[PDB]
Each structure stands twice: as structure tokens, then as C-alpha cells.
């Protein structure tokens, strides 16, 4: 019942806000929360949240953050860290641009 996380990059080739979407699926009896980090540093990114849509056995949800268009292709590493209080398990995903 631990979460699975995948982060997708909805952006065109042209440089310069660019959205970044974190999808969390197959998780949370009870609940879990999502934190966004830049190069391992939290507190810099605030993503829009969505309510849980339940299948009845589990649920999925996602969050999306507006990352500045001048950071992509500069080598910055972005990540989505999903932590589930129940089961005491934390999972994360990591994305990068292409300089």
C-alpha cells in the first residue's frame, strides 16, 4: 500500500512559468502527503493540490507546480517526495532538464 510516484514534464522545446506534474498512485489507506524539492532543498516550491479520488481500495492524486522558465536547461534537479505516515514509508521521484 506504499505509494508509487511519477513526475512528468509538460513543456515545449522553446526555453522560457513551466508546469511540472507529480502523479501519485496506488496509495494511502488513510492519507499521505507530497513535498516538492529543488536539488534536494525543500520550501522553495508550492504546488496546487487536489482531493483524493478513491476507488475504495486505494486512491490516486497529483500536484502541479509552476517552475520558472529560466531554471530549466540550467542543470537544476527537481524532485517530488511523497511520504506516507502509515507504513512509515517515503518514496520519491527525480526529474531534470536537458541543457
Amino acid at each position: 500500500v506504499a505509494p508509487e510516484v511519477q513526475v512528468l514534464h509538460p513543456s515545449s522545446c522553446t526555453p522560457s512559468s513551466v508546469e511540472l506534474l507529480c502523479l501519485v498512485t496506488g496509495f494511502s489507506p488513510a492519507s499521505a502527503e507530497v513535498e516538492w524539492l529543488v536539488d534536494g532543498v525543500g520550501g522553495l516550491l508550492v504546488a496546487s493540490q487536489s482531493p483524493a479520488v478513491r476507488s475504495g481500495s486505494t486512491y490516486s492524486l497529483s500536484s502541479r507546480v509552476n517552475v520558472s522558465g529560466t531554471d530549466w536547461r540550467e542543470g537544476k534537479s527537481y524532485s517530488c517526495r511523497v511520504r506516507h505516515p502509515a507504513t512509515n514509508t517515503v518514496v520519491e521521484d527525480h526529474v531534470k532538464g536537458c541543457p
Partner: antibody, heavy 112, light 106 residues
Framework: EVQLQESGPSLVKPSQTLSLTCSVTGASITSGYWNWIRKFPGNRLEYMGY???????YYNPSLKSRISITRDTSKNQYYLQLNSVTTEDTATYYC??????WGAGTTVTVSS | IVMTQSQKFMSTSVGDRVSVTCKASQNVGTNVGWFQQKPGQSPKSLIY???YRYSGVPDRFTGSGSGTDFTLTISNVQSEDLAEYFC?????????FGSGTKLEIK
């Protein structure tokens, strides 16, 4: 900012309440994912606490019903209480924010 | 989680490469990081992410390894880095730290 300043009694007695505080300067405590860890006189260390941005907490096994880690939103301060010190808890305590910012730490000696 | 270092201390001359082998029981994926002990200074973290670099970190070292066996490999050691390196694992939330490996000048 990244300035985490440790404070505590320095010396306590075996039966007295041990209480430590961390002053966290930079970002906000409300950002969450703040922890409390300790390093023993040897080179082993262990995790001993978490505070969520929501106010929820987590306690490490073997310190059940003792840690009672608490935060103060207006002060931007966090603090630990272990009830009786028990004389074994002489490790250096550190304020680390989930591997992001490690601050100053300090030991507390227990003697009588 | 159970963590251990394969060697408590190591020594190497300036300019050469050093490495630390971190072993653990269970399977923690890639949820690891490295930590630089600085005696007399506040200790500081590195490789905060899962085997990926952290902001500011010197380019001498990046994360490596997976699952059960992780390594630190710092090439071209320079200045004052003769201290303990700790392996940290956060896969399971009752977070476990291993012992550090001390680097000596020779």
C-alpha cells in the same frame, strides 16, 4: 536562511526532566519536515523525532511516550522533552530538518 | 533498518581517490544520502537526494550504488576533508544511520 541554534540545560540529574530547544532561522518551521536526532559518545547516532507542517508528529520506537516533540509557531522554535533523563541519554543532540540544514548541537551530561 | 560500514577508517594522500562502502540489510532502493562530519563545526550533509548531487556540493563526488550496497567515491581529495563520512538511509521512516568512516592523511 540556514541557521539552526541548539540550546539546553547542559547538565541534568538522573531523575530531572530533560528539555532542549532549537531556534530555526530561515524559511519557516511551517515548511515542515523538521526532525530531532542524537549522536552517542561513540560514532553511532539515531533518529528521535519529526514534526509535520500540520502539527502531526512521529516518534521513534524505544522512546515511546517520552519524546513529546513540540513546536511554537510564533517563536519559530522547536523543543524536546524526554521526561526522566535516565542517565543513558548523554548523546549530542542535533536539529537537522530532514537532511537539509544541520544546525549546532550539544551534549547534556547526567551525573549525581 | 540495519546499516554498517565495511571499514571504520581509511587513509589516503592528497590528490588521490578514496571510497567508502556502505552496506545494509533489507532493501531500501536508492533512498540514501551522504554526510560530512566536521569536528568543531556544525556537521553538514551532501548527496541529499537519492544518489544525486545536492546544492553547492563539490564536483569531486556524486552518489553511486543501489538496493543493498552503496558507495562513496571522492576523487582528488583536497584541503581539509580528513573526517568521518556517514551513510544515511531514509527508505523506512524509523530512519537509521550507520557509523562514519574516518579519512586520514596517509
Amino acid at each position: 536562511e540556514v541557521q539552526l541554534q541548539e540550546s539546553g540545560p547542559s547538565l541534568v540529574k538522573p531523575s530531572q526532566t530533560l528539555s532542549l530547544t532549537c531556534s530555526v532561522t530561515g524559511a519557516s518551521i511551517t515548511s515542515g519536515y523538521w526532525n530531532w536526532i542524537r549522536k552517542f559518545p561513540g560514532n553511532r547516532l539515531e533518529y528521535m523525532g519529526y514534526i509535520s507542517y500540520s502539527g502531526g508528529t512521529y516518534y521513534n520506537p524505544s522512546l515511546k511516550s517520552r519524546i513529546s516533540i513540540t513546536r511554537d509557531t510564533s517563536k519559530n522554535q522547536y523543543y524536546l522533552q524526554l521526561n526522566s533523563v535516565t542517565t543513558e541519554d548523554t548523546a549530542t543532540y542535533y536539529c537537522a530538518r530532514d537532511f537539509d540544514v544541520w544546525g549546532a548541537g550539544t551534549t547534556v551530561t547526567v551525573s549525581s | 533498518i540495519v546499516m554498517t560500514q565495511s571499514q571504520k577508517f581509511m587513509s589516503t594522500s592528497v590528490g588521490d581517490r578514496v571510497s567508502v562502502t556502505c552496506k545494509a540489510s533489507q532493501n531500501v532502493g536508492t533512498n540514501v544520502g551522504w554526510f560530512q562530519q566536521k569536528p568543531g563545526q556544525s556537521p553538514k550533509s551532501l548527496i541529499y537526494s537519492a544518489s544525486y548531487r545536492y546544492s553547492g556540493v563539490p564536483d569531486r563526488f556524486t552518489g553511486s550504488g543501489s538496493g543493498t550496497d552503496f558507495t562513496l567515491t571522492i576523487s582528488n581529495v583536497q584541503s581539509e576533508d580528513l573526517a568521518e563520512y556517514f551513510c544515511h538511509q531514509y527508505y523506512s521512516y524509523p530512519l537509521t544511520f550507520g557509523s562514519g568512516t574516518k579519512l586520514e592523511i596517509k
